[model samples]
Target: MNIFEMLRIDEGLRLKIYKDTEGYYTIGIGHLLTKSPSLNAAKSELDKAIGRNCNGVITKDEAEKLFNQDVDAAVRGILRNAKLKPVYDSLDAVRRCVLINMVFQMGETGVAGFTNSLRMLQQKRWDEAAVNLAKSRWYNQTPNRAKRIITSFRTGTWDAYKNL
Candidate 1:
């Protein structure tokens, strides 16, 4: 249900990490993804994107204002991109969160996004699905964290979303 349970981060992040538009890209270890990211930002962004993806489209001014309100806004932008439609399939909360976590970091609009992963999931190709996840613009950028999460997902050993 949680990103942690999905990506498997009980010990917590071993290294500091920064994310690109997607948790897909890592600025560097020990660096903040942006100025800062908080859970409040996640909830807020999710609400903005899907909860009100259509109801209240973020305008340029509102977008800037929201980003200013939460440095995590940058990261939230990434999470907002994910379809999260997988949840409709009733995937385990952990799995769904794991996918969302990685996609959050990597921007789900692309292959690493929920799209490609969902394809693999539908085929029941868990291993391929895991590998496909790592094959993203984000993963190519954030090798360290990507490797960790990919390994965990394939082995069914980690969660990627809880703390995300």
Candidate 2:
């Protein structure tokens, strides 16, 4: 499966505005509208994307569009890091998706801070990379999701996350 399909299962699609686990106002597949410079303007943009004043609701198509945009940004963010460029380039597609997924959840800076894990990943040390990831606060906060990602990193496949 592609990154979008994989993330759709991981992030889950939501056509309506709701509070995320961190209590932020989110919409359309983990899009954190609350973090915007202006919440009203962000919602207005969402309405525009939906082709009307959505009254806090969006269509599946619009949600997918937003999701794609978010994923694109995440990928760009990950690639913008000079230290990560070579490591990212050395990975296969499945492992690349795992990196993107981590960036999607924790931001590029957070992932970048995992220096040891990134080195492990670069060296093709799958189990070592997984072990390094498991020691993080990110893993502790969302064990299930982190476990799936760790498994993908270790196995270099989507087998651990195929349920969706």
Candidate 3:
């Protein structure tokens, strides 16, 4: 497997920042995303991955390379799923990105499991899609992350959660 895929498999798909097995705050497939000015942000990102401070560090360029590849794979997987095409195609660019993000966090199979939400989205019932998404166990696991997507879906605006 490619190193990027190895990292993905090792870190898994985490939509929200959470502690790792070593108890360091982490996010986005093992990157420490804390905006702490006091901490060496770049160093912390690598430390958690190798379980050491100075063993290896990924430059922004390298990290972006991996991220782009991972995201592309996720998006393609989502697009290829016949069951998800209606919901995927019916959404606007932002919503499509949001769904792709969801697929990144939760695999295509998991994203497909949101049948009612997908149906609501396909029908262009933004409100129902938001509500259906909110009622999921995913919301319970990551309320803040879920809220961002739900709000965007409900309002038909992605400004609020585009970065996520």
lDDT of 3 at 23: 53
> For every model shown, what is its TM-score relative to the native structure?
0.44, 0.88, 0.66
Candidate ordering by TM-score (highest first): 2, 3, 1
C-alpha-based local distance difference test score of model 3: 0.66
Model 3, range 109-138, lDDT digits (tens) per residue?
998998888888899898877888888788
Model 2: colliding residue pairs: none
lDDT of 2 by residue, 1-164 (tens): 87888887877888888767766668889887765555676677667666788888888878888888889999888788887677889999899988998888878888888999999999999988889889988888889889999999999988986775
RMSD of each: 11.2, 2.4, 9.2
User: What is the Cα-based TM-score of model 1?
Assistant: 0.44
The global Cα lDDT (0 to 1) of model 2 is 0.84
* lDDT tens per residue, model 1, 74-117: 23544454454533254554455455555434344543345776
Looking at candidate 1, what is the lDDT of residue 10? Answer: 22
Q: In model 3, where do residues sit more than 4 Å from their true spots? A: 1-56, 162-164
Between candidates 2 and 3, the one scoring higher on TM-score is 2
